Amino acid sequence: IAAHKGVNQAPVPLKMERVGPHDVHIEMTAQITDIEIDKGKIYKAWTFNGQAPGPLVVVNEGDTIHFTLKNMDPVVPHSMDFHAVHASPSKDFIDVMPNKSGTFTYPANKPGVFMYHCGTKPVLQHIANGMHGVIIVKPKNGYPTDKEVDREYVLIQNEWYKYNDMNDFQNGVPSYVVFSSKALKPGDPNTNGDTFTLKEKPLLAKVGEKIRLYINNVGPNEVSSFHVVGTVFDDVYLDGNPNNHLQGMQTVMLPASGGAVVEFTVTRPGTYPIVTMQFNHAQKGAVAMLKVTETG
Amino acid sequence: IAAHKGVNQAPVPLKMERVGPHDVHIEMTAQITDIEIDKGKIYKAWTFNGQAPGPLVVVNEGDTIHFTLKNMDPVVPHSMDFHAVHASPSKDFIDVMPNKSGTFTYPANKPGVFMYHCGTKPVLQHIANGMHGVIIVKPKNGYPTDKEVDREYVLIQNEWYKYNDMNDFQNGVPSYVVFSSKALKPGDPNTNGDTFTLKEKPLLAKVGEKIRLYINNVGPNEVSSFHVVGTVFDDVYLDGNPNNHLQGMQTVMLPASGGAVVEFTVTRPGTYPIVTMQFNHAQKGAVAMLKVTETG
Amino acid sequence: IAAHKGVNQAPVPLKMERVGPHDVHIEMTAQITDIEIDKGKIYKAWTFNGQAPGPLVVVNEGDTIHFTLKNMDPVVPHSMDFHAVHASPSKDFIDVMPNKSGTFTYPANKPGVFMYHCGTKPVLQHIANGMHGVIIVKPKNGYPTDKEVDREYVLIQNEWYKYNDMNDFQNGVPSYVVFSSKALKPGDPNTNGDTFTLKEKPLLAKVGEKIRLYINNVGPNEVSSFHVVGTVFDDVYLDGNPNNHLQGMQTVMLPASGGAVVEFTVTRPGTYPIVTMQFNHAQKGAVAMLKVTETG
Ligand SMILES: [Cu+2]
Ligand SMILES: [Cu+2]
Ligand SMILES: [Cu+2]
Ligand SMILES: [Cu+2]
Ligand SMILES: [Cu+2]
Ligand SMILES: [Cu+2]
Ligand SMILES: [Cu+2]
Ligand SMILES: [Cu+2]
Ligand SMILES: [Cu+2]
Ligand SMILES: [Cu+2]
Ligand SMILES: [Cu+2]
Ligand SMILES: [Cu+2]
Ligand SMILES: [Cu+2]
Ligand SMILES: [Cu+2]
Ligand SMILES: [Cu+2]
Ligand SMILES: [Cu+2]
Ligand SMILES: [Cu+2]
Ligand SMILES: [Cu+2]
């Protein structure tokens, strides 16, 4: 796109503030930002806030979100579809023109780990170029295993294709498949979908801990066979809904856009790969690491 | 196939009649019928009854089906495999020669939303050319959420490949991925798998309604990541079995041949896309629309 | 690999012995063995014990496994990752050099049907060349439907690609997709992943029996839409964990590495195909047969 040549808009922080016991304001940008997706490979991504996947959103069950999208892209319209919300897509997930803002309000009625993404046609183009992310809706009554959890992180799986190539997006295998992590608490890492960061800078934990991961596969096109090497999931909540409880799973199948809360125990010191067992995708980047030490 | 050149057999209605409190007669054809799968693209499909996917079958749990297949194809044998039934495949799902009929009897013991398809070798060829469909078996005791449902429809996902091309069928990406709808009540739409009908003529509903969809992904080759934009599934019954209850799912993973009953609320007026979140498939046709109005 | 030219190491039996009420010794080889994966097609597989998938391992819930790998490969290191166990991957799933042995100990805390596979980088290469298999961990308290089961077998799904071709492994469609069966009791068949054995020598059963299959899809890359033609699964336990109970499923979605226990009734004499309903894969080999007779 001629108007994107040389454009690299610095990342902008997510803005969130609570405005009532059940109402929250969220402000995000659409922007065009260079991201290193593999060593030596820059992708001039279409993003929310200069991150791909975008910044984490966390709200409580029953919160109404008053969402503003500020479109920094000089030429392409953008939009937002939160899978957490009940909304009229033709009224509430509509386009915001370049250099404009739009505000939309809708409730997050349902607990879980939801995809969000741009909803502008062609949606495949917007998602594949980077406009995806996760919103977590915390359950009013928690999960039954909350008291057992020692530490928690968020991990997101996505693919990357040939740059802005709709043929490839439709018809081609992914060039890379990758994990990222998005921060829940101060000091947690906050990374973009790339082949290397979570190998070189593993997630950290302590021997004996029960770890919870909030996970989502944003696609755009592939399913995920999510597995932590050297453990078994004690408990799994599909889509993060407390009612969708499974136990003792080796691997969690996630559709495109599918989420889960998964919990597992790390019994011994060492480094534990986190993979999709679709090993062509693992080979193409989709391995993260969890370093487990006597201290954490 | 030389004997198919110029053949376009007009669609024939499904024939069904109940013959006892737990016995039903069903009569279907195998026939060769031109279907417009995308604008300007005719596929000379191999079909049941001139529809692809084929006509909807609905029976009750515990019904024995006395099924007749009348093979109108001038040269290729055809057969029927209902995933609802208990049967001997080598006796009951056998071929019917051109210009012949065959009758087979078997029970539908299990509630749910089942694939049916031709079982003639090579089965991939017969399915890919269009010989697939859905049989619904209604549970004796309903679903627990029956009283909440305001409206219901059937949606089927399938792929289309290069015409009658076994190489492509085995080794190629789908050319199109599509939804169709099959009528449960008078006045419901009844459409074939194409890229456009359910966009131009959306399914209809009223503001505030809880909608039930009976869904099946007939493949032949892909899985489906089924999602209704702007809502969350309140309740999901995998394969349509009441016992396989999930709640609050954003997206339902369906294997090839996989079914579900899904229920969700439409809170606001507007048009709600229905998609597979495998967005390469959505781009290649797999988007239907639900138009929600103050009146329905 | 120059050092593999002409190498065809005869299969070696699995060695297992119980050494305590909750401790078992297991001894396996890594070895290079020619396997006929399709008629006229030899693949010089990388294997455990000269089988691909490897030999079945069965232990009890709560058993600690003291595992020895003897690496017969003259040049490539190999390793073992059991998905059943809790272990430190960087200490316990490490490489064993050519002509060396290594011993590792870890507990199998969780009931189910788990993948095992080589964990040597590149893991895709090692899995795709044949180093995969299944370990069953029997639940302390059984399954609730145990008393209903008349007969049982193990079936494994895997893919085969162009020989030792990392490009193909990453980027290509499978050349073959196949079932194998691994013996639980004397007289059961024990076969390798090939397109033909379980068609020419079907699994056997008797009219009216409830059959249990312990199943796993080891990939490396595809998901499986597992279906037995002419029946419906009465009961399904995802990953073989008794708590993950589904009923009345037509088809069981398995991720890559995913397992299940599935149970179904065969009501009539005949031959019952066992397939993945991803019919491109079925066409490329993934059909097994179950022959049901008045005597068994
Ligand atoms: Cu309140
Ligand atoms: Cu406000
Ligand atoms: Cu966009
Ligand atoms: Cu892929
Ligand atoms: Cu703890
Ligand atoms: Cu694994
Ligand atoms: Cu009666
Ligand atoms: Cu009759
Ligand atoms: Cu046919
Ligand atoms: Cu596809
Ligand atoms: Cu209502
Ligand atoms: Cu979506
Ligand atoms: Cu004891
Ligand atoms: Cu020992
Ligand atoms: Cu190896
Ligand atoms: Cu495939
Ligand atoms: Cu019995
Ligand atoms: Cu089938």
JSON list of N, CA and C in Angstrom, two decimals, chain A residues 151 205-209 266-270 291-296, chain C residues 91:
[
{"chain": "A", "resi": 151, "resn": "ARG", "atom": "N", "xyz": [0.57, -19.54, 40.08]},
{"chain": "A", "resi": 151, "resn": "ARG", "atom": "CA", "xyz": [1.05, -18.54, 39.15]},
{"chain": "A", "resi": 151, "resn": "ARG", "atom": "C", "xyz": [0.20, -18.64, 37.88]},
{"chain": "A", "resi": 205, "resn": "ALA", "atom": "N", "xyz": [8.77, -19.99, 36.49]},
{"chain": "A", "resi": 205, "resn": "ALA", "atom": "CA", "xyz": [8.00, -20.59, 37.54]},
{"chain": "A", "resi": 205, "resn": "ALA", "atom": "C", "xyz": [8.92, -21.31, 38.54]},
{"chain": "A", "resi": 206, "resn": "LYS", "atom": "N", "xyz": [8.30, -21.77, 39.59]},
{"chain": "A", "resi": 206, "resn": "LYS", "atom": "CA", "xyz": [9.02, -22.42, 40.68]},
{"chain": "A", "resi": 206, "resn": "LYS", "atom": "C", "xyz": [8.65, -23.90, 40.76]},
{"chain": "A", "resi": 207, "resn": "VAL", "atom": "N", "xyz": [9.60, -24.72, 41.18]},
{"chain": "A", "resi": 207, "resn": "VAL", "atom": "CA", "xyz": [9.37, -26.14, 41.34]},
{"chain": "A", "resi": 207, "resn": "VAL", "atom": "C", "xyz": [8.16, -26.40, 42.21]},
{"chain": "A", "resi": 208, "resn": "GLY", "atom": "N", "xyz": [7.27, -27.31, 41.79]},
{"chain": "A", "resi": 208, "resn": "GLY", "atom": "CA", "xyz": [6.08, -27.67, 42.52]},
{"chain": "A", "resi": 208, "resn": "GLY", "atom": "C", "xyz": [4.83, -26.86, 42.30]},
{"chain": "A", "resi": 209, "resn": "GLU", "atom": "N", "xyz": [4.95, -25.74, 41.60]},
{"chain": "A", "resi": 209, "resn": "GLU", "atom": "CA", "xyz": [3.83, -24.85, 41.39]},
{"chain": "A", "resi": 209, "resn": "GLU", "atom": "C", "xyz": [2.79, -25.47, 40.44]},
{"chain": "A", "resi": 266, "resn": "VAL", "atom": "N", "xyz": [4.16, -28.39, 37.63]},
{"chain": "A", "resi": 266, "resn": "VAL", "atom": "CA", "xyz": [5.54, -28.58, 37.23]},
{"chain": "A", "resi": 266, "resn": "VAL", "atom": "C", "xyz": [6.30, -29.17, 38.43]},
{"chain": "A", "resi": 267, "resn": "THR", "atom": "N", "xyz": [6.72, -30.42, 38.30]},
{"chain": "A", "resi": 267, "resn": "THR", "atom": "CA", "xyz": [7.19, -31.15, 39.46]},
{"chain": "A", "resi": 267, "resn": "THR", "atom": "C", "xyz": [8.69, -31.06, 39.70]},
{"chain": "A", "resi": 268, "resn": "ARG", "atom": "N", "xyz": [9.49, -30.75, 38.72]},
{"chain": "A", "resi": 268, "resn": "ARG", "atom": "CA", "xyz": [10.94, -30.82, 38.74]},
{"chain": "A", "resi": 268, "resn": "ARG", "atom": "C", "xyz": [11.54, -29.59, 38.13]},
{"chain": "A", "resi": 269, "resn": "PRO", "atom": "N", "xyz": [12.75, -29.21, 38.57]},
{"chain": "A", "resi": 269, "resn": "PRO", "atom": "CA", "xyz": [13.42, -28.12, 37.90]},
{"chain": "A", "resi": 269, "resn": "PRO", "atom": "C", "xyz": [13.83, -28.45, 36.46]},
{"chain": "A", "resi": 270, "resn": "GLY", "atom": "N", "xyz": [13.76, -27.46, 35.60]},
{"chain": "A", "resi": 270, "resn": "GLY", "atom": "CA", "xyz": [14.12, -27.62, 34.23]},
{"chain": "A", "resi": 270, "resn": "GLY", "atom": "C", "xyz": [13.38, -26.64, 33.35]},
{"chain": "A", "resi": 291, "resn": "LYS", "atom": "N", "xyz": [10.67, -21.91, 32.20]},
{"chain": "A", "resi": 291, "resn": "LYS", "atom": "CA", "xyz": [11.84, -22.28, 33.00]},
{"chain": "A", "resi": 291, "resn": "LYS", "atom": "C", "xyz": [11.45, -22.35, 34.43]},
{"chain": "A", "resi": 292, "resn": "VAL", "atom": "N", "xyz": [11.62, -23.52, 35.02]},
{"chain": "A", "resi": 292, "resn": "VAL", "atom": "CA", "xyz": [11.19, -23.85, 36.34]},
{"chain": "A", "resi": 292, "resn": "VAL", "atom": "C", "xyz": [12.43, -24.03, 37.25]},
{"chain": "A", "resi": 293, "resn": "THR", "atom": "N", "xyz": [12.51, -23.18, 38.28]},
{"chain": "A", "resi": 293, "resn": "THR", "atom": "CA", "xyz": [13.69, -23.16, 39.15]},
{"chain": "A", "resi": 293, "resn": "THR", "atom": "C", "xyz": [13.28, -23.39, 40.59]},
{"chain": "A", "resi": 294, "resn": "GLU", "atom": "N", "xyz": [14.27, -23.72, 41.43]},
{"chain": "A", "resi": 294, "resn": "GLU", "atom": "CA", "xyz": [14.00, -23.93, 42.84]},
{"chain": "A", "resi": 294, "resn": "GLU", "atom": "C", "xyz": [13.43, -22.64, 43.51]},
{"chain": "A", "resi": 295, "resn": "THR", "atom": "N", "xyz": [13.84, -21.48, 43.02]},
{"chain": "A", "resi": 295, "resn": "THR", "atom": "CA", "xyz": [13.24, -20.18, 43.47]},
{"chain": "A", "resi": 295, "resn": "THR", "atom": "C", "xyz": [12.11, -19.46, 42.66]},
{"chain": "A", "resi": 296, "resn": "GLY", "atom": "N", "xyz": [11.87, -19.81, 41.42]},
{"chain": "A", "resi": 296, "resn": "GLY", "atom": "CA", "xyz": [10.94, -19.07, 40.58]},
{"chain": "A", "resi": 296, "resn": "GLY", "atom": "C", "xyz": [11.52, -17.90, 39.78]},
{"chain": "C", "resi": 91, "resn": "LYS", "atom": "N", "xyz": [16.00, -32.54, 31.61]},
{"chain": "C", "resi": 91, "resn": "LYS", "atom": "CA", "xyz": [16.77, -33.52, 32.36]},
{"chain": "C", "resi": 91, "resn": "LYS", "atom": "C", "xyz": [16.38, -34.94, 32.02]}
]
